[PDB]
Write an enzyme that holds these catalytic residues in place. Sequence first.
Site, mmCIF file in Angstrom:
data_model
loop_
_atom_site.group_PDB
_atom_site.id
_atom_site.type_symbol
_atom_site.label_atom_id
_atom_site.label_comp_id
_atom_site.label_asym_id
_atom_site.label_seq_id
_atom_site.Cartn_x
_atom_site.Cartn_y
_atom_site.Cartn_z
ATOM 1 N N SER A 142 6.334 3.993 17.097
ATOM 2 C CA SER A 142 6.594 5.415 17.006
ATOM 3 C C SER A 142 6.672 5.957 18.452
ATOM 4 C CB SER A 142 5.434 6.050 16.214
ATOM 5 O OG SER A 142 5.708 7.361 15.766
ATOM 6 N N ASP A 250 15.232 4.866 10.642
ATOM 7 C CA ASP A 250 13.876 5.351 10.826
ATOM 8 C C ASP A 250 13.641 6.641 10.045
ATOM 9 O OD1 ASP A 250 11.234 6.188 12.296
ATOM 10 O OD2 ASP A 250 11.780 4.210 13.068
ATOM 11 N N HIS A 295 9.233 3.781 8.832
ATOM 12 C CA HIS A 295 8.818 4.082 10.194
ATOM 13 C C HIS A 295 7.617 3.226 10.564
ATOM 14 C CE1 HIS A 295 7.631 6.699 13.656
ATOM 15 N NE2 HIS A 295 6.407 6.519 13.188
#
EC number: 3.1.1.98
Length: 345
Positions: A142, A250, A295
Site C-alpha cells: 500500500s 488495485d 489491495h
Amino acid sequence: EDLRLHLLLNTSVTCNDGSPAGYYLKESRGSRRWLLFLEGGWYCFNRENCDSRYDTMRRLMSSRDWPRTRTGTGILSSQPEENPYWWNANMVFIPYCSSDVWSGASSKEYAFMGALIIQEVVRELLGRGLSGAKVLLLAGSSAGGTGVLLNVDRVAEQLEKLGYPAIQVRGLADSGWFLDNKQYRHTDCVDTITCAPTEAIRRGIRYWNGVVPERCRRQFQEGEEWNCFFGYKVYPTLRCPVFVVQWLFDEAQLTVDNVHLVQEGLRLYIQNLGRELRHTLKDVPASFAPACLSHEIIIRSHWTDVQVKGTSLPRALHCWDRSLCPVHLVDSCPWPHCNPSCPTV
C-alpha cells in the site's frame, strides 16, 4: 518465535502524536538476509483530515496502542510452508506512524517523520547484526509500497556512508504503484479516500514537508515533485533493483478514482485502467501483476496461493533474487477476477 517491539532510542524521531516510534524485530543468527517491511494505510494531508484520522484511526498515528509482539505473516512469516525461501531471515516490521507515505523529513501541529523513522531504524539495526548482512530487502504494501520507491535509494545511500557497501539494498513495492489519472466521476477533494491521486499528493507533500528521491527530483520542475510518488514516473531513475507487485485492479486505485461497486462507460474505465497499468509495467523487468481486484498481498498468509503464468509470487521473488524461471509475470487478461488464483480471503 515472534517479533519483539523496540522503540527508537533517539527520541527526537516520533509519531504524529509525538509518541516514540519503533520497530518489531525477530532475529535469525544463521541468516545474512534481512527484510524491512513498511506498513501501509493511506496518508493524511491537512489538519482537518489528520484530526479526523486521529479520532478514528489512532493506531496509525501513535505508538500508544502498539502490541508488544507481532507474529510474522506472509513474507515476514517464519513458517517454511508460509515462507518457502525467506522464513529463516531476520525480520523487521515498521509500523506506519507518520501518515506521510514515509516522505516526511523534518523534525519540527502533527509531525511527519516517515523518512527519518526509516533512517533511525536502519542505524539502530546495524547495532543488532545488520552490519553482517549480505542482503537487505526493503519491502512494503500500500503506502509502504510507495514508501519503498521513495526511500530505497536513500537507504543504500545511507549504508555506504556509514561504511557498509557490502550490504545489497533491494526493494519490493506491493500495491504502491499508482496512476495519476482522471477519476471515473469527479469529486471535490474534501475527504482523503475520495480525493484524486494528484491533488492529494500536491497538498500532502507541502503539508508533510515531503522529500523525494533526488534522481527523480532533477527530472521535474520545482514545486512539481508530487510526480515522484507515482511508480512509473519514479522507477526509471532507480539505482537499486526493485520488484513490483501490483493487482491490475488495485482496490485502492479504484477508491481514489471514485469507483464504488454496470453502465457501458464504466466497463471501459475499468477495462482501460487495467490496460494503462499493464502498459506502465512493460519497462519493469521484475514484476508480478495478476488480474485480480484486491489491495495488498505480501503481508498476507494466502500470498503463496496467487499465480500469474502458472508461477507463484514467492517463486518469482526467488527467481528475481537468483537473477541478481520467469521474472516478468504480468496478466494479459482484460477483466477483474479473470484469473483463477484471485483472492477470496
